[PDB]
Amino acid sequence: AAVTLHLRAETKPLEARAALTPTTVKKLIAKGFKIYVEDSPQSTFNINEYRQAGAIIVPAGSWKTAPRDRIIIGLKEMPETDTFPLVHEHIQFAHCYKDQAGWQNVLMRFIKGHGTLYDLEFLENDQGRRVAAFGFYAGFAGAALGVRDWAFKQTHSDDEDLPAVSPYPNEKALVKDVTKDYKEALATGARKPTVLIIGALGRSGSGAIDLLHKVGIPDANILKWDIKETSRGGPFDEIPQADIFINCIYLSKPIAPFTNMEKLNNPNRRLRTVVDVSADTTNPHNPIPIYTVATVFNKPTVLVPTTAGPKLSVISIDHLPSLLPREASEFFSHDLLPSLELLPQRKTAPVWVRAKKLFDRHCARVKRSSRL
């Protein structure tokens, strides 16, 4: 009945997060788990932390020849160039349940190997809430970058953009950098910014608020909006009037937009920076219809081409957690831990059964001559 878990090294480029951290490895061993951890030079964690936490350290890629009873756990996808049979039970985000390009081939690997995929994205408690997601640090990182861009606009001319950003080793280091930029902006005479957050009550919302407090933005300067306020229906006057607008709500139905080029095109607009934490380029009904580009760490902002008012930019990065890969891992892995403790009963425990049955359903959709 004792479970062996094998933490696969991520092979997705620049993926520095991990599904189990040294702290959660340690708790799982205390609970009688046996844990192997692959050496991962891309991981934000040093291998030696897992060593001290009691893991058995093995080479990157060693899961491929591991005994068939080991549960292989990772965060992100397999190399699409690998085509060999998946024989193990795997725990990971596989991004193949939503008709993604190549989704059938993903599943064909498991089918051919008689392996099982328990998809992280669809582990839910009995009320159907996801047990583990990356919201909080998405909102934290997003806010951090909106302050940096707002501050950047106070200290540089419009013909310059916020430079390339990089992941940080810990939250303290991010806060200190944001704070430095921010104090420099205030030294020019800029007043302390007001920030509108839409979706203030979810985890991303709370992350954004937490960042602003820690940077020193007065609580009075933060307009904390959720459904109560947005159901009134847009466009919202409060958006061009804020210095920074952080959106944390995903909306994809044909409703009235939060704002538009018409409301933005105005010499009295104070808004300098929009961080769309929910940004999704494939949203048919983007409620902030002012940008088409999904921005990235090497080029984190895109101009909104206004015809009046100060220079205005959008941050639409869709991997904001990756700015703080250590804290993002810790929180995700902590939240995932009670479900991992149920792995000895995964044949019957609904959290695991839901994920297995769902795998089988998506598998049934795959119609291939090679299965005859």
Asked about 213 being catalytic, the answer comes back as: no
Q: Contact, 186 vs 343, CB < 8 A?
A: no
d(CA 258, CA 232): 10
CB-based burial, 28-65: b 16+ in 10 Å, e otherwise: beeeebebbbbebebbbbebebbeebbbeebeeeebee
Q: Contact, 230 vs 258, CB < 8 A?
A: yes
130 is in an annotated binding site: yes
Instruction: Report the structure determination method.
Output: X-ray
d(CA 60, CA 227): 45
Asked about 76 being catalytic, the answer comes back as: yes
Element (H, E) at 143: helix 135-155
* Nearest partner of 3 among 51, 35, 44, 26, judged by Cα: 35
d(CA 331, CA 316): 23
- Given 34, 95, 112, 224, the catalytic residue: 95
295 is in an annotated binding site: no
**Which domains, ranges and CATH numbers included, belong to the chain?**
1-133+325-372 (3.40.50.720), 134-324 (3.40.50.720)
Q: Contact, 11 vs 3, CB < 8 A?
A: no
d(CA 109, CA 131): 27
- Given 76, 192, 299, 311, the catalytic residue: 76
d(CA 128, CA 344): 22
Q: Contact, 265 vs 309, CB < 8 A?
A: yes
* Nearest partner of 17 among 352, 320, 355, 337, judged by Cα: 320
How many other C-beta atoms can be found within 10 angstroms of the C-beta atom of residue 250? Answer: 15
Angle 187-192-194 (CA atoms, 0-180°, nearest 5)? 155
Residue where the block lists tokens 């105005």: 266
12 is in an annotated binding site: no
Torsion on CA atoms 151, 152, 156, 161, rounded to nearest 10 = -150
- What tokens were used for 55? 């893991």
177 is in an annotated binding site: no
| CA 82, chain centre distance (Å) | 25
